[PDB]
């Protein structure tokens, strides 16, 4: 038997960031300046994104190494926040549209955007940690779902197959390919097991802004005409559900949960289309 449905807990005090670490423009504003930026990056921006992506991948790995029964999601946040700040990176989530922490921690039926708090992880949970770094004027964005103790087969297989669907999608990226191949491959793979791929949340172009207006669907929609070109930077980040797609948002305005409380898993990397293929920027 696995735990029952989650409820929100209490947040820790806001974690400070030294002032010499530049803030993204949206910190202190109610919305963000994003969605109309070019999709192909310059070489200088790409080089900076490799830095941001490695630092994000570091923070995710350190926080993920900490996932175990008994640890709170706030403890994961303090680990991610300190790794980012000690690397001179601003945690991009902190202050985005008022988001109060430095990463998102999404257990079990939480599709995305969970807020680190007093929630205690327990045996059988699956814990998504999403870490984003802003450094060098650019963002890196990455996430993974980590098992806590012995996870029930249904849930273990959801996590492993979601990781596999993400890697199969990443491996289709190449110049000249329709962007829509990504959601074709993910949805085809998920459909093997009767999983449902989330539609209303998507991958995104990312560069000097976090959601730059490029949208990467994770479901099949071949009418999209966008082609992958060298220098494009964007994420692949499917959320795959055991249950139905219907969801609710908690009163905090962030936490998105499945309406039927069946569990859901996600993995995410920031990618660069190269002249021949793809480079994952959010690798160690
Ligand atoms: N689409 C998406 N990728 N990773 C997330 S975690 C939330 C988040 C992280 C950073 C920033 Cl600047 C904005 C947001 Cl919404 N969401
Ligand atoms: Ni993310
Ligand atoms: Ni993302």
From Swiss-Prot:
Ligand binding (a divalent metal cation 1): 130, 141, 268
Binding sites annotated in the UniProt record for a divalent metal cation 2: 141, 204, 237, 268
Catalytically driven reaction(s): Release of N-terminal amino acids, preferentially methionine, from peptides and arylamides
Enzyme Commission no: 3.4.11.18
Entry's transmembrane regions: none
UniProt GO BP: proteolysis
Described purpose of this protein according to its UniProt entry: Removes the N-terminal methionine from nascent proteins. The N-terminal methionine is often cleaved when the second residue in the primary sequence is small and uncharged (Met-Ala-, Cys, Gly, Pro, Ser, Thr, or Val). Requires deformylation of the N(alpha)-formylated initiator methionine before it can be hydrolyzed.
HAMAP family for the chain: MetAP_1 (MF_01974)
Identification of the protein by name: Methionine aminopeptidase 2
Primary gene name: map
